[PDB]
């Protein structure tokens, strides 16, 4: 609750694009460094045909002359879609907006430097906590794949390997929990009942 961090890692699975992007933009303007993972696992409300229709309209938007300067560059990567949303909500043409954009980083999948780190979630943007059970929803990764994103399979195998390594890490964490709890009991067997009652009384 109102906590300041060196950097906040947000796991993008199950988050609404607009709400999560708006929260990230406000945090950037506040000065909190934000990084977002699983942009391919981000979610958009409505139906997938509506999503395809709007982003195909965006593709239809082009400059008349050579599409190299001043023309809308259609980035088909899900991370770049999230970046486009946040950029639209950021005053990108000002120095403050440029600073916020530099404070923001977005990625696809979870590279090792952030897979060996903790991921936070935003309750105000969670699909489960926000959308009605009967409503339909679509996947940014599926949209990007069917519009032109080329590396859905790459992130698929990399994510699967990360899953295997994380499962091994959890198994070793189970073993650590075993040892920790057994140590708790064994030490509490001779833990100076006076100090133990002191901890009990003070609430720890």
């Amino acid at each position: 609750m109102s906590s300041f961090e060196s950097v906040v890692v947000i796991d993008g699975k199950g988050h609404l694009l607009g709400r999560l992007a708006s929260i990230v933009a406000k945090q950037l303007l506040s000065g909190q460094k934000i990084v977002v993972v699983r942009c391919e696992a981000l979610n958009i409300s409505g139906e997938f045909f509506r999503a395809k229709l709007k982003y195909h309209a965006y593709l239809r938007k082009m400059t008349r002359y050579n599409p190299t300067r001043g023309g809308p560059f259609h980035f088909r990567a899900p991370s770049r879609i999230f970046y486009k949303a946040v950029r639209g909500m950021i005053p990108h043409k000002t120095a403050r907006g440029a600073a916020a954009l530099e404070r923001l980083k977005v990625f696809e999948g979870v590279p090792p430097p952030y897979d060996k780190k903790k991921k936070m979630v935003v309750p105000q943007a969670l699909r489960v906590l926000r959308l009605q059970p009967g409503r339909k929803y679509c996947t940014v990764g599926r949209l990007s794949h069917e519009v032109g994103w080329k590396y859905q399979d790459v992130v698929a195998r990399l994510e699967e390997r990360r899953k295997a390594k994380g499962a091994a890490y959890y198994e070793r964490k189970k073993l650590a929990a075993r040892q920790l709890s057994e140590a708790k009991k064994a030490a509490a067997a001779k833990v100076d009942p006076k100090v133990s009652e002191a901890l009990a009384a003070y609430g720890y």
């Binding site: 030490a187 002191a198 901890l199 003070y202």
Partner: protein
């Protein structure tokens, strides 16, 4: 003819179910008004857990596992108090895990500065015992 179903076992709202308000008190449901609002009353002698008879929103209400066995619908304050004392709602609430968390939170909040320093020292000692034990194991 073997059936294996693992679904979610929610708590049912019914006449006799006691709920915990956001103010930390308890109230048994006397009758259900709508699918979002109920009528509830806690005739608890304890001032902290006392709740006046009135409308409770199920959005602001949290369902506790304790339930009054056979509380009649529309039971007025005297009957509800009789059922409360007979079933020992206060004692079972004290035994409930949620009340343990509430007491721990209140007591942590009531810790003072010198109490915090003593917690520092005493946790360091207790930690010392465990730290060794963990190597042994």
């Amino acid at each position: 003819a073997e059936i294996n179903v693992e679904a979610t076992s929610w708590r049912r709202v019914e006449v006799g179910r006691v709920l915990k308000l956001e103010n930390g008190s308890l109230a048994a449901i006397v009758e259900i008004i709508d699918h979002k609002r109920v009528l509830a009353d806690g005739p608890s002698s304890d001032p902290k857990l006392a709740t006046p008879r009135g409308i409770v929103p199920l959005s602001r209400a949290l369902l506790t596992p304790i339930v009054i066995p056979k509380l009649p619908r529309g039971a007025r304050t005297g009957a509800v108090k009789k059922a409360w004392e007979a079933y020992g709602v206060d004692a079972k609430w004290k035994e409930t895990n949620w009340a343990k968390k509430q007491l721990q939170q209140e007591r942590r909040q009531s810790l003072t500065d010198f109490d915090r320093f003593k917690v520092m020292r005493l946790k360091k000692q207790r930690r010392f015992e465990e730290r060794k034990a963990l190597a042994k194991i």
